[PDB]
Amino acid sequence: WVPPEVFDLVAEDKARCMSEHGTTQAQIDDVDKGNLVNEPSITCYMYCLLEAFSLVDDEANVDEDIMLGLLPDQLQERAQSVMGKCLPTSGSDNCNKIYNLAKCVQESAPDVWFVI
Numbered sequence: 001w002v003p004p005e006v007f008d009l010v011a012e013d014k015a016r017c018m019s020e021h022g023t024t025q026a027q028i029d030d031v032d033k034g035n036l037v038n039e040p041s042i043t044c045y046m047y048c049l050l051e052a053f054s055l056v057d058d059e060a061n062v063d064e065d066i067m068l069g070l071l072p073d074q075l076q077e078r079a080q081s082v083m084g085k086c087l088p089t090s091g092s093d094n095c096n097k098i099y100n101l102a103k104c105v106q107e108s109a110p111d112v113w114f115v116i
């Protein structure tokens with residue numbers, strides 16, 4: 001469902017986030033396929049990229065309105081349903097909060113789940 005335009009929009013932040021955190025594309029592909037581990041090089045990548053687009057703040061609180069703003073209408077209240085379950089975020093730090101959120105969302109909605 002993700003438009004191709006999104007890929008060029010995120011390219012610059014994706015490069016920076018991967019470089020900052022030691023992330024490999026293979027780690028991203030693995031999360032993308034539903035396999036999540038609590039490794040900072042991928043969890044901090046996910047936090048990094050969300051933050052770059054104002055989807056989370058300095059304590060990994062999710063901005064639900066901006067998030068709903070970005071999704072298409074067909075997912076718009078599946079997402080509200082998933083956010084009801086999975087928010088607020090909780091964890092030992094920003095990266096771990098996003099790990100637990102990722103775990104929750106992908107379990108709650110696997111056929112829509114993805115990470116760029």
Ligand SMILES: CCCCCCCCCCCCCCCC(=O)O
Nearest residue numbers: 009046049050053101102105115116
């Ligand atoms: C759903 C929370 C779990 C963790 C999410 C994984 C990180 C992927 C972040 C996607 C960033 C997309 C921002 C692009 C918005 C746009 O410019 O159109």
Ligand SMILES: [Cl-]
Nearest residue numbers: 061062088089
């Ligand atoms: Cl939250």
